[PDB]
């Protein structure tokens, strides 16, 4: 997937042709609950498919599994062809970018996550480190009132030009078990770890799919994540290619 005019877009695109080996490593303190997490899988950015599995290395996690998704790599996103020039997240790689986020939970804590999202030889890894604070501790978070699934959403990506990076604010809704949701309101930033150009892009949005489920063979805690992510909202000319 090289051929783009762009020697830009091209060095990025390079990176992510065919799969893409992942390693995710997590560690975690909600309430003083602390807790750490692995994943390993693959991120196919041609079809902005991710497979992964993440285990709770520290035993039962003691948050829902769905409350981590988010935090748990955006550059495996589909650019469609007319918009990988604004593909900031490829464009970081290989030397990578940092992703940081608040996360408000509606009437409850909130997780701050700091993470480093880079290769390291042919492997993107994604080392994420939470703090969560101020749960209620029967709350729909710490009383794990949430269901086993997960909604499709749409990110909101802006230019951040002071910090050469990104921002996005976006609304995470979590099904509760008695048919009500959880709102989870996010913030992020992403700024490069390199001091090279980055590809900064005009607004649009990262439309997103994602399935849970378990592995029947599987004793440890976990959660098995296939996700799709779909970059949208600019159009392309000539006004129009099929007018």
């Not at 091209?10 to 390693?23: A, H, Q």
């Given at each position: 997937?090289?051929?783009?005019?762009?020697?830009?877009?091209?060095?990025?695109?390079?990176?992510?042709?065919?799969?893409?080996?992942?390693?995710?490593?997590?560690?975690g303190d909600v309430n003083g609950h602390?807790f750490?997490?692995?994943?390993?899988?693959?991120?196919?950015?041609?079809?902005?498919?991710?497979?992964?599995?993440?285990?709770?290395?520290?035993?039962?996690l003691p948050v829902p599994?769905?409350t981590l998704?988010?935090?748990?790599?955006?550059?495996?996103?589909?650019?469609?062809?007319?918009?990988?020039?604004?593909?900031?997240?490829?464009?970081?790689?290989?030397?990578?970018?940092?992703?940081?986020?608040?996360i408000f939970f509606k009437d409850d804590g909130n997780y701050k996550?700091?993470?480093?999202?880079?290769?390291?030889?042919?492997?993107?890894?994604?080392?994420?480190?939470l703090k969560g604070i101020d749960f209620k501790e029967d709350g729909n978070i710490l009383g794990h009132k949430l269901?086993?699934?997960?909604?499709?959403?749409?990110?909101?990506?802006?230019?951040?030009?002071?910090?050469?990076?990104?921002?996005?604010?976006?609304?995470?809704?979590h099904?509760?078990?008695?048919?009500?949701?959880q709102?989870a309101?996010?913030?992020?930033?992403?700024?490069?770890?390199?001091?090279?150009?980055?590809?900064?892009?005009?607004?649009?949005?990262?439309?997103?799919?994602?399935?849970?489920?378990?592995?029947?063979?599987?004793?440890?805690?976990?959660?098995?994540?296939?996700?799709?992510?779909?970059?949208?909202?600019?159009?392309?000319?000539?006004?129009?290619?099929?007018?």
């Amino acid at each position: 997937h090289h051929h783009h005019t762009d020697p830009m877009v091209s060095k990025g695109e390079e990176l992510f042709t065919g799969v893409v080996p992942i390693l995710v490593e997590l560690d975690g303190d909600v309430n003083g609950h602390k807790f750490s997490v692995s994943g390993e899988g693959e991120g196919d950015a041609t079809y902005g498919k991710l497979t992964l599995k993440f285990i709770c290395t520290t035993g039962k996690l003691p948050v829902p599994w769905p409350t981590l998704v988010t935090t748990l790599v955006l550059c495996f996103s589909r650019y469609p062809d007319h918009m990988k020039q604004h593909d900031f997240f490829k464009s970081a790689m290989p030397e990578g970018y940092v992703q940081e986020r608040t996360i408000f939970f509606k009437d409850d804590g909130n997780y701050k996550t700091r993470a480093e999202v880079k290769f390291e030889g042919d492997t993107l890894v994604n080392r994420i480190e939470l703090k969560g604070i101020d749960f209620k501790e029967d709350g729909n978070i710490l009383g794990h009132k949430l269901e086993y699934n997960y909604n499709s959403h749409n990110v909101y990506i802006m230019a951040d030009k002071q910090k050469n990076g990104i921002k996005s604010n976006f609304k995470i809704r979590h099904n509760i078990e008695d048919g009500s949701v959880q709102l989870a309101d996010h913030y992020q930033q992403n700024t490069p770890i390199g001091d090279g150009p980055v590809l900064l892009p005009d607004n649009h949005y990262l439309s997103t799919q994602s399935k849970l489920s378990k592995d029947p063979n599987e004793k440890r805690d976990h959660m098995v994540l296939l996700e799709f992510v779909t970059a949208a909202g600019i159009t392309l000319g000539m006004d129009e290619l099929y007018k």
